[PDB]
């Protein structure tokens, strides 16, 4: 929850992350996406599409409680993000969490 | 009405039995317009040289009815 959001903010500040669906899909195909976050308000078709790729590529998937706007606010960007991937957590330890 | 640019095809439409008459038109820009009346379409051919205008005229089969400036 709050710890996950803090770890995500630290990962976005230090590590490498792609807060985009196409970028996350490319990272999942390449296998470099260790962890991914999917917004609750995302369509079920898109959520299942990310889940299938995550299972194929052996990547952790976390369902954020908030909507796309809430996910964007947590990420600190000025636009809502429906899905994000963290290739490297940097100083953050969100990979274990 | 179709505009035909390839000389040989205009010959082969003329040789086709569906062709009935052909019209020769002399335009002010010294272009001659071979207008071949067919069943569905009027095929026209614009050739710029006066001499290709002439060697075309008798290369048309004699059975087809050529007509002077309409």
């Amino acid at each position: 929850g709050d710890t996950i959001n803090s770890k995500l903010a630290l990962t976005m500040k230090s590590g490498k992350y792609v807060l985009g669906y196409k970028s996350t899909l490319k990272t999942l195909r390449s296998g470099k996406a260790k962890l991914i976050l999917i917004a609750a308000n995302a369509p079920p078709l898109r959520k299942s599409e990310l889940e299938y790729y995550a299972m194929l590529s052996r990547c952790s998937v976390h369902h954020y409680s908030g909507n796309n706007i809430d996910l964007g606010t947590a990420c600190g960007k000025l636009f809502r993000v429906g899905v994000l991937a963290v290739i490297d957590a940097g100083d953050s330890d969100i990979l274990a969490a | 009405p179709r505009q035909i640019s390839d000389i040989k095809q205009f010959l082969e439409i003329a040789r086709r039995k569906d062709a009935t008459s052909a019209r020769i038109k002399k335009n002010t820009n010294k272009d001659v317009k071979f207008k071949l009346r067919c069943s569905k379409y009027l095929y026209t051919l614009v050739v710029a040289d006066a001499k290709k205008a002439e060697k075309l005229r008798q290369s048309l089969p004699p059975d087809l009815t050529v007509t002077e400036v309409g």
Binding site: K26, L28, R29, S30, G31, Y53, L56, S57 | -
Partner: protein, 134 residues
């Protein structure tokens, strides 16, 4: 690492949309003509029909005949699947020369069709051979 030779996938767009193919060679590193994650994959354009014992031998052979098609597809336009078919013939037979030369492409397509027919006769890769309804 998700894209490797011999991995069965599905096409997402184009004329052969919703068609199962096998990744013959991966060019994810890119190419001058193919500057993306293009993978040359050969699939089946006409899935084999249901063979009936009562039907004649010629009819059964015609139903079992599969027409293949080999083409390059984008990584985004390709949907990977869990199933994988390790076709020895459809491994390294596709190259730039094969894609360029039309006669070589036809020969490669004939070889792929023969390999697919042999696999169908052997009853292997049933899920890949069976068309998927949309």
């Amino acid at each position: 690492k998700i894209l490797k030779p011999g991995k069965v996938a599905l096409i997402t767009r184009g004329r052969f949309a919703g068609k199962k193919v096998v990744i013959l060679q991966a060019i994810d590193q890119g190419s001058k003509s193919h500057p993306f994650g293009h993978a040359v994959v050969a699939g089946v354009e006409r899935y084999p029909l249901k063979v009936t014992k009562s039907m004649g031998a010629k009819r059964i052979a015609r139903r079992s005949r599969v027409k293949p098609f080999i083409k390059v597809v984008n990584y985004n336009h390709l949907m990977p699947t869990r199933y994988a078919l390790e076709l020895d013939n459809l491994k390294g037979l596709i190259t730039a020369d094969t894609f360029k030369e039309p006669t070589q492409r036809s020969a490669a397509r004939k070889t792929v069709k023969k390999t697919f027919e042999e696999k169908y006769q052997s009853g292997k890769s049933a899920w890949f051979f069976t068309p998927l309804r949309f």
